[PDB]
Amino acid sequence: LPMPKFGPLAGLRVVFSGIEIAGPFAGQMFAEWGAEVIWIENVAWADTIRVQPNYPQLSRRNLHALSLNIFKDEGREAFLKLMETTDIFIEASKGPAFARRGITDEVLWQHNPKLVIAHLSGFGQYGTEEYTNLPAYNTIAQAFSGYLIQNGDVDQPMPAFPYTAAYFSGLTATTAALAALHKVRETGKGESIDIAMYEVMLRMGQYFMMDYFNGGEMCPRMSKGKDPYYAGCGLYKCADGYIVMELVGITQIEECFKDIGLAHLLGTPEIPEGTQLIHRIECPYGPLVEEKLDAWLATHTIAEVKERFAELNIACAKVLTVPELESNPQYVARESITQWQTMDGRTCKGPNIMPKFKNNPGQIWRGMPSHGMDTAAILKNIGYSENDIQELVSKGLAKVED
Amino acid sequence: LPMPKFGPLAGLRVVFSGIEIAGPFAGQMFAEWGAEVIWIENVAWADTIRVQPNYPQLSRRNLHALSLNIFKDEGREAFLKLMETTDIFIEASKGPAFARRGITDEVLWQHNPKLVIAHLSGFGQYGTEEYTNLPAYNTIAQAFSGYLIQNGDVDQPMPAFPYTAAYFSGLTATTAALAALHKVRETGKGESIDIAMYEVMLRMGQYFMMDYFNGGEMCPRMSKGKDPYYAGCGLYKCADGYIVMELVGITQIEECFKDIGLAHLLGTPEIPEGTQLIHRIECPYGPLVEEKLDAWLATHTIAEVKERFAELNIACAKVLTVPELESNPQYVARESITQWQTMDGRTCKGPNIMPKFKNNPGQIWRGMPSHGMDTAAILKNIGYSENDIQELVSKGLAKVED
Ligand SMILES: CC(C)(COP(=O)([O-])OP(=O)(O)OC[C@H]1O[C@@H](n2cnc3c(N)ncnc32)[C@H](O)[C@@H]1OP(=O)(O)O)[C@@H](O)C(=O)NCCC(=O)NCCSC(=O)C[C@@H](O)C[N+](C)(C)C
Numbered sequence: 001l002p003m004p005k006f007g008p009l010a011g012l013r014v015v016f017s018g019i020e021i022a023g024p025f026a027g028q029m030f031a032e033w034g035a036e037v038i039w040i041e042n043v044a045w046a047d048t049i050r051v052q053p054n055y056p057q058l059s060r061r062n063l064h065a066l067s068l069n070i071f072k073d074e075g076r077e078a079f080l081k082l083m084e085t086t087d088i089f090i091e092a093s094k095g096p097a098f099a100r101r102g103i104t105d106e107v108l109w110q111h112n113p114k115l116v117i118a119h120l121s122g123f124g125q126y127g128t129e130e131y132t133n134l135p136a137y138n139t140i141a142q143a144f145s146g147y148l149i150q151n152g153d154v155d156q157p158m159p160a161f162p163y164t165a166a167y168f169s170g171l172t173a174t175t176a177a178l179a180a181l182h183k184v185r186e187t188g189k190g191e192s193i194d195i196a197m198y199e200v201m202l203r204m205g206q207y208f209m210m211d212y213f214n215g216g217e218m219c220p221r222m223s224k225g226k227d228p229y230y231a232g233c234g235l236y237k238c239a240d241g242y243i244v245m246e247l248v249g250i251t252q253i254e255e256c257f258k259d260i261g262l263a264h265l266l267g268t269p270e271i272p273e274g275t276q277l278i279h280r281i282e283c284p285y286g287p288l289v290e291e292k293l294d295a296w297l298a299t300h301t302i303a304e305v306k307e308r309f310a311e312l313n314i315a316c317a318k319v320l321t322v323p324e325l326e327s328n329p330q331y332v333a334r335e336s337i338t339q340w341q342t343m344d345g346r347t348c349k350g351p352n353i354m355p356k357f358k359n360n361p362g363q364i365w366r367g368m369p370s371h372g373m374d375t376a377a378i379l380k381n382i383g384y385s386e387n388d389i390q391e392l393v394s395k396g397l398a399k400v401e402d
Numbered sequence: 403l404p405m406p407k408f409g410p411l412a413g414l415r416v417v418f419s420g421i422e423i424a425g426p427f428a429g430q431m432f433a434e435w436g437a438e439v440i441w442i443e444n445v446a447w448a449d450t451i452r453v454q455p456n457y458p459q460l461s462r463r464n465l466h467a468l469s470l471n472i473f474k475d476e477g478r479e480a481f482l483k484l485m486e487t488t489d490i491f492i493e494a495s496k497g498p499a500f501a502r503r504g505i506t507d508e509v510l511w512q513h514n515p516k517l518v519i520a521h522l523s524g525f526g527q528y529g530t531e532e533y534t535n536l537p538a539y540n541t542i543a544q545a546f547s548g549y550l551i552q553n554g555d556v557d558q559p560m561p562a563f564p565y566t567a568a569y570f571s572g573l574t575a576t577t578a579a580l581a582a583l584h585k586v587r588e589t590g591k592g593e594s595i596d597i598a599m600y601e602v603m604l605r606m607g608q609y610f611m612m613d614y615f616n617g618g619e620m621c622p623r624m625s626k627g628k629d630p631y632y633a634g635c636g637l638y639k640c641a642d643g644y645i646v647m648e649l650v651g652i653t654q655i656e657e658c659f660k661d662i663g664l665a666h667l668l669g670t671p672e673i674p675e676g677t678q679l680i681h682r683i684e685c686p687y688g689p690l691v692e693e694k695l696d697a698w699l700a701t702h703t704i705a706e707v708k709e710r711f712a713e714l715n716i717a718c719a720k721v722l723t724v725p726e727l728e729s730n731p732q733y734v735a736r737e738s739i740t741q742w743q744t745m746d747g748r749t750c751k752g753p754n755i756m757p758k759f760k761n762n763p764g765q766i767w768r769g770m771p772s773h774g775m776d777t778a779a780i781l782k783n784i785g786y787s788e789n790d791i792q793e794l795v796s797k798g799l800a801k802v803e804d
């Protein structure tokens with residue numbers, strides 16, 4: 001299929017079946033980095049993402065579009081021929097839906113013994129009858145993993161946003177596939193990978209949860225963007241708006257205490273000389289620390305705080321709003337935000353490829369394709385006759401091609 | 403170095419320098435999957451994570467511990483010998499700190515032309531003088547990327563939690579390194595990777611931000627855990643506690659409207675027959691929808707809602723608290739939470755390896771090592787004499803070994 005040769009993944013053949021964020025995100029990351037990536041959509045329906053007015057232009061770029069009923073007679077027979085040339089297949093469904101419908105890993109490996117198979121689901125490929133076959137979205141994975149309960153204010157739990165768990169899960173699928181791809185080069189044998197969204201999110205929520213699993217208490221939720229345990233960490237207000245900061249390190253603490261008027265606290269039994277973090281709940285002086293930090297910050301502008309925090313090696317930043325991003329000199333300097341052309345010739349704006357590969361940078365070579373745009377070009381590459389693909393179209397096995 | 407042969411990454415040699423979450427997380431994921439992973443700590447100081455009472459037992463497991471002043475005379479000379487046997491090196495610092503201190507990518511490639519180098523920083527390896535060399539933590543990356551402003555309640559922005567951006571950045575580093583590792587096998591030439599935390603997070607926040615970049619408005623923040631745009635999506639309350647749900651799909655909407663008493667809305671100009679999502683702000687009936695959903699949900703228990711939502715293929719889940727995770731039958735069935743022994747022989751509880759590799763599952767083979775635990779065993783493997791390592795210890799170039 002005609003495509004520029006670029007990125008660390010040039011000439012890798014990746015195929016994905018899935019809607020919305022998680023599976024498509026996993027597959028599309030391959031295409032950001034120069035892989036040949038085929039997006040499978042249903043025949044009668046199309047990927048739900050297409051309902052979004054702008055995002056899909058970013059989230060489906062560099063992709064080739066396919067419409068095949070991958071479960072029916074000849075539609076199934078081509079999917080399996082396709083799999084013989086594919087290095088990596090990502091599928092996102094309700095549990096072992098592929099296996100239930102006949103496309104086992106064993107069936108897939110009969111067509112390609114080397115194939116890497118990444119299964120993405122809410123609850124896993126196996127488990128109990130109650131959960132294994134349930135549908136899931138980001139929010140369901142946040143709820144079930146204990147991530148949701150950790151987010152929000154003291155009195156109001158809420159999801160991390162936008163759709164955080166869908167990005168973690170898709171990114172994990174990309175990572176695990178690439179690791180499995182490595183193993184295939186070493187041994188010539190394929191792999192199957194069972195990525196459960198709740199299990200991904202369980203991991204991402206362990207920083208304090210590990211306290212609960214090993215004798216401790218669980219942490220509370222943040223109060224108004226402030227770290228639940230650590231003073232001087234999180235959302236603060238200066239004289240002229242919100243900043244973030246992290247009071248971390250021996251020197252940072254010594255010098256910051258001196259500024260806010262707490263010099264005399266340094267060297268006491270509960271704050272000995274090598275102290276690199278202050279726990280707000282364990283420390284009787286924790287609230288005092290907050291009171292003085294808050295009071296000292298409200299006196300200074302964001303610019304004055306930044307200048308002094310730079311002198312002390314204290315990490316901080318202005319809380320930026322979306323309209324402030326484009327003109328930020330760091331963004332401009334690094335071309336963090338760029339433009340490209342859509343398939344119909346409009347100009348599209350949004351993030352550049354990330355991260356930056358030095359020797360083999362990714363690039364944007366195609367806009368989002370339309371439903372089944374390349375279904376006819378792929379089936380013909382897979383050896384199917386000109387008439388043969390006309391017969392797939394008619395029987396409703398292959399679709400759109402508009 | 404003595405270690406079991408397992409996982410898709412068996413026999414891969416990975417080295418990382420970094421503290422807290424982001425860099426160490428990137429490097430440790432390799433070890434979850436059977437790579438030989440060397441953790442570098444400073445000589446006089448030790449990784450800040452060690453201050454946490456339990457988490458490091460999970461986040462530093464399967465690792466080999468090294469203490470070398472990687473910038474001083476002979477300490478530097480060994481780091482570079484080590485690099486000659488290393489496949490992947492992950493470093494997390496303030497911008498191009500390694501280059502500034504003399505360890506360029508060019509210097510590194512003179513020792514190993516194949517080496518994959520992953521640079522993790524807040525603001526990138528290059529940019530403007532104002533930002534490029536600034537320190538960063540999760541919160542700084544959330545602030546600078548527009549992610550922070552998207553999280554929280556209508557009136558109160560707050561970070562996604564716990565330390566969300568540190569996990570995305572580290573996971574991206576793992577992914578990018580594995581992709582670059584692939585390219586080395588294809589061409590025999592190494593790679594350098596520039597992972598800026600704000601650029602990672604910019605990507606993860608694009609779902610609605612793409613509206614702003616292309617003519618639209620930016621979305622508001624959630625109100626009490628409810629999707630800012632889409633009715634029937636997010637945090638809801640049943641008669642006996644919090645659930646999440648996603649009203650998505652043609653059938654799901656038709657049948658749910660019928661239940662909540664909104665049957666008559668189906669088929670109107672603004673809700674035509676194929677409607678798969680309802681936008682709450684664009685739709686005059688959006689608030690009505692919420693009012694009826696809320697009212698119908700408050701009548702039913704979580705169990706009754708789940709049973710009916712299963713009948714209709716509507717994704718949902720109980721919002722679980724941490725103490726509910728261990729005994730969940732899906733968790734138990736999949737061994738999502740497991741136990742292992744620490745280096746000093748205590749029993750440790752926490753998440754199992756994720757995801758599940760079928761043919762080559764990861765495993766937990768070692769607890770977190772102590773500071774410099776393996777520094778003497780690594781230097782001797784790298785060819786340094788028994789006396790030679792005694793001279794490194796004394797001059798303060800190599801440390802702990804306790
Ligand atoms: C799709 C899904 C989310 C549940 O929806 P569904 O039951 O309507 O399934 P479907 O894919 O739409 O298609 C229904 C049937 O259609 C079949 N099908 C799908 N593609 C096909 C093809 N090419 N050929 C033949 N059959 C095909 C499927 O196998 C399936 O058959 P089954 O009933 O036997 O399972 C399910 O795939 C699933 O749970 N996947 C795992 C987790 C996952 O990736 N979910 C998405 C997370 S991303 C996310 O959270 C974003 C979201 O929150 C944002 N928003 C608020 C806007 C919605």
Ligand SMILES: CC(C)(COP(=O)([O-])OP(=O)(O)OC[C@H]1O[C@@H](n2cnc3c(N)ncnc32)[C@H](O)[C@@H]1OP(=O)(O)O)[C@@H](O)C(=O)NCCC(=O)NCCSC(=O)C[C@@H](O)C[N+](C)(C)C
Nearest residue numbers: 422423424444471472494495496499523537538539540568
């Ligand atoms: C460490 C860092 C976070 C800023 O701290 P620092 O300035 O104190 O740097 P350091 O690593 O502690 O060491 C200071 C010096 O010590 C040197 N050094 C470090 N290791 C060495 C070695 N082995 N040999 C010789 N020198 C060594 C460093 O090069 C460095 O020299 P420089 O001043 O020339 O830059 C910086 O590495 C950085 O910004 N990294 C990139 C982003 C990153 O990974 N940050 C962590 C995100 S994870 C996260 O967000 C978790 C956190 O939010 C949770 N909590 C609330 C509890 C804190």
